[PDB]
Design a protein around this ligand. Structure first.
Ligand code: NA
Length: 129
């Protein structure tokens, strides 16, 4: 599913990301934009052999099982394919664990490089929240 920005804002808000660990909703929408282009089906192989999955590009190195990432963990206790569903519940629950882990949203490289320090509220401009 390719979400619209306001559609995604509403879903992320429904699921409790607005202000989760102090990160406003616009941070999460901006992160999804630059991680996945709002596409729940996005997958990207990393140089270490892990893969990033879904709307928030959750990595198989730590967070989910894909069966092809040796010596990895599954700390969200989910198959990585769950993270590609049109329903973002599993991605949001896992993102809440990731952002709690110690470096906050710096776990998302696109957030750090493209959203952090910017006017992230623009990403929710005009949305009915
Ligand atoms: Na894994």
């Amino acid at each position: 599913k390719v979400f619209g920005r306001c559609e995604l804002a509403a879903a992320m808000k429904r699921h409790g990301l607005d202000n989760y660990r102090g990160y406003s909703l616009g941070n999460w929408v901006c992160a999804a934009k630059f991680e996945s282009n709002f596409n729940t089906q996005a997958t990207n192989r990393n140089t270490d052999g892990s893969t990033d999955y879904g709307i928030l590009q959750i990595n198989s190195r730590w967070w989910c099982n894909d069966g092809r990432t040796p010596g990895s963990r599954n700390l969200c206790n989910i198959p990585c394919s769950a993270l590609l569903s049109s329903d973002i519940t599993a991605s949001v629950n896992c993102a809440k664990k990731i952002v709690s882990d110690g470096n906050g949203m710096n776990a998302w490289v696109a957030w750090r490089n493209r959203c952090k320090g910017t006017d992230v509220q623009a990403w929710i401009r005009g949305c009915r929240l």
